[PDB]
Amino acid sequence: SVAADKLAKLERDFGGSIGVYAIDTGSGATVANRPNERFPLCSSFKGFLAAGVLAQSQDKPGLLDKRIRYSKAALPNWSPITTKHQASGMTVAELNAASVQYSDNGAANLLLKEINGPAALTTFMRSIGDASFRLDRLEPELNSAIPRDPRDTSTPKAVAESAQKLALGKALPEPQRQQLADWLKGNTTGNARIRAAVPAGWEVGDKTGTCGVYGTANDFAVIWPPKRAPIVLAVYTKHAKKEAKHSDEVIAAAARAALEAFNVKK
Ligand SMILES: *C(=O)N1C[C@H](NOS(=O)(=O)O)CC[C@H]1C(N)=O
Structure with a gap:
């Protein structure tokens, strides 16, 4: 496809592998490159962590309101939000906001x-x-x-x-x-x-x-x-x-290639 060719060229110049999966939920059309190959999640797992916490909240109402208090020494590196709020604690909802929206590592480990x-x-x-x-x-x-x-x-x-x-x-x-x-x-x-x-x-x-x-x-x-x-x-x-x-x-370029296959162009 057009998209597959563009993605192959991106890979050549990048020197590594680019995995893509796009779904147009209107038509059902898809774009794929290396769809079934494994890639490290890195911080992206935190979006799924949020979903897993929300799934627990169906069981335990008030879970999002539960206040979590923690020590300064227990926070890992890259914890800007949790560090700032150590004196107040943070609710489970606030921790998800920091984990998802700021990629706060301390928040993710607490959740x-x-x-x-x-x-x-x-x-x-x-x-x-x-x-x-x-x-x-x-x-x-x-x-x-x-x-x-x-x-x-x-x-x-x-x-x-x-x-x-x-x-x-x-x-x-x-x-x-x-x-x-x-x-x-x-x-x-x-x-x-x-x-x-x-x-x-x-x-x-x-x-x-x-x-x-x-x-x-x-x-x-x-x-x-x-x-x-x-x-x-x-x-x-x-x-x-x-x-x-x-x-x-490279990530933005790969996104552009997939979106063009769906007739979406910035
Ligand atoms: C996630 O991969 N991490 C936490 C933080 N993420 O911000 S990013 O997702 O905008 O890059 C910094 C990088 C990384 C980490 N070192 O844990």
Whole structure:
């Protein structure tokens, strides 16, 4: 296809692999590249963590209102929101907002503890029919991104299909789906990635990941146009060389190629 050819050229210049899965929920059309290959999730797992916490909240009402207090010394690196609010604590809802919208690592590890760990999140994902997602480790060790290593990975197809089920479909009850959507829509970290390829002003709920090694970074998004049906897009990169840098521009370019196949151009 046009899109496949553009994605192949992006891979050649990048020197590594670009996994793409896009779904136009209007027509059902798809764009795929390396759809079933594993890529590290990095911070992108936090969008699915939010869905797993919301799933627990159907059981335990008031869960989003529960205030979590924590020590300063227990926070991992890259915890800007949780560090700032240590004296006040944060509610489970606030922690999800920081985890999803700022990629706060301390928030993500606190919510992992709330839902009983990476295996528990993986079980929730299996319960929606996602057989690919696996979370094995906590922040920051989950970002090692070692080539061929299956820990803390998913596939582009499974990321996009699960994002569809959770943020557009019925895997969560409607109030929880709306909350997940609203958290993703207020992300602040994705402006150079999928969003860079989306027409101005359209709502985009996305979650980025940047492992910081092996050219490994990613973004997945649900795009809500004003005039046409939602589109779901997952873009994941990896590279065989430890020192290879990830590229926002490559991710944005891959998003552009997929969206052009759906006749969406910024
Ligand atoms: C997620 O991959 N991480 C936490 C934070 N994420 O921000 S990003 O998703 O906008 O890149 C920083 C990078 C990374 C990490 N080092 O844990």
